[PDB]
């Protein structure tokens, strides 16, 4: 559907607001900085479709005490407008908070879906649980594939990504090879999307089990993959920060989703 009438500033072709970083990848990619979206624009064209943005965390043994505090600022920070489920996996369930929802957000505990996540949301969104929002995170991330730039390397010449070196491990990236190196958290895409990727990391971890090999795991397999199928959009570290270890760099004009000491 057609959208409504909107009154915003002009975007300035032979003005950018970003001359300081990269806000396009190489593959015609959009790389989300502050300053490079429209929100109202965004938020419109989502809403006009009633997306639906699965958000799927781990929550196991002591990780259930990170819980309160990531729900409750996802409450106030993560798609507010749209329509969000929670997906909870956790060992203790009896231990998840009891945490009060915006209209339109439900949360599902999973004790520990494939059919069940095509059918109940548009999008998914696999983060980590001992994290933050503290600011904005919303439908500029949407895409049919995301990940975002780690923290500690997107300053960093890519012989330096901590990639799976092995030449033996089905994760092998040779040190000529690299775009970026995406954390192993804050990935997401269409609910097709995501599920052809933990198929694809699912069999590879178990081809390099068979063959008796285990350097990061998750996030070594996880960039091979990206390496391999591009994204159609990549987060900057604003997406994805640690204060306490990295501090406020200039480049950060927020700092939306953080870790938590
Ligand atoms: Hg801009
Ligand atoms: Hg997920
Ligand atoms: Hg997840
Ligand atoms: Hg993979
Ligand atoms: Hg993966």
């Given at each position: 559907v057609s959208l409504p009438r909107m009154v915003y500033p002009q975007p300035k072709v032979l003005t950018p607001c970003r001359k300081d970083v990269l806000v396009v990848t190489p593959w015609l990619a959009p790389i989300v900085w502050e300053g490079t979206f429209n929100?109202?624009?965004?938020?419109?064209?989502?809403?006009?479709?009633?997306?639906?943005?699965?958000?799927?965390?781990?929550?196991?043994?002591?990780?259930?005490?990170?819980?309160?505090?990531?729900?409750?600022?996802?409450?106030?920070?993560?798609?507010?407008?749209?329509?969000?489920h929670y997906y909870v996996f956790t060992d203790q369930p009896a231990?998840?908070?009891?945490?009060?929802?915006?209209?339109?957000?439900?949360?599902?505990?999973?004790?520990?879906?494939?059919?069940?996540?095509?059918s109940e949301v548009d999008y998914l969104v696999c983060v980590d649980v001992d994290m933050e929002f503290?600011?904005?995170?919303?439908?500029?991330?949407?895409?049919?594939?995301?990940?975002?730039?780690?923290?500690?390397?997107?300053?960093?010449?890519?012989?330096?990504?901590?990639?799976?070196?092995?030449?033996?491990?089905?994760?092998?990236?040779?040190?000529?090879?690299?775009?970026?190196?995406?954390?192993?958290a804050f990935f997401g895409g269409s609910v097709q999307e995501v599920q052809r990727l933990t198929r694809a990391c699912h069999q590879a971890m178990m081809v390099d089990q068979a063959n008796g090999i285990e350097v990061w795991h998750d996030a070594?397999?996880?960039?091979?993959?990206?390496?391999?199928?591009?994204?159609?959009?990549?987060?900057?570290?604003?997406?994805?920060?640690?204060?306490?270890?990295?501090g406020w760099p200039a480049v950060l004009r927020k700092l939306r989703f953080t870790a938590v000491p």
């Amino acid at each position: 559907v057609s959208l409504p009438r909107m009154v915003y500033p002009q975007p300035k072709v032979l003005t950018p607001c970003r001359k300081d970083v990269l806000v396009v990848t190489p593959w015609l990619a959009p790389i989300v900085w502050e300053g490079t979206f429209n929100i109202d624009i965004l938020n419109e064209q989502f809403r006009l479709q009633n997306t639906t943005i699965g958000l799927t965390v781990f929550a196991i043994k002591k990780y259930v005490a990170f819980l309160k505090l990531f729900l409750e600022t996802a409450e106030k920070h993560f798609m507010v407008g749209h329509r969000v489920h929670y997906y909870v996996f956790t060992d203790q369930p009896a231990a998840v908070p009891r945490v009060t929802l915006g209209t339109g957000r439900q949360l599902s505990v999973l004790e520990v879906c494939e059919r069940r996540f095509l059918s109940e949301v548009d999008y998914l969104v696999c983060v980590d649980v001992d994290m933050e929002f503290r600011d904005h995170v919303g439908v500029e991330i949407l895409t049919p594939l995301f990940g975002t730039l780690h923290p500690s390397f997107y300053g960093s010449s890519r012989e330096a990504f901590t990639y799976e070196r092995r030449p033996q491990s089905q994760a092998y990236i040779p040190k000529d090879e690299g775009d970026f190196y995406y954390m192993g958290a804050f990935f997401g895409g269409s609910v097709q999307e995501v599920q052809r990727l933990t198929r694809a990391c699912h069999q590879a971890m178990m081809v390099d089990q068979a063959n008796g090999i285990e350097v990061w795991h998750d996030a070594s397999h996880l960039n091979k993959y990206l390496l391999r199928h591009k994204p159609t959009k990549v987060l900057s570290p604003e997406y994805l920060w640690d204060q306490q270890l990295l501090g406020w760099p200039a480049v950060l004009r927020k700092l939306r989703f953080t870790a938590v000491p």
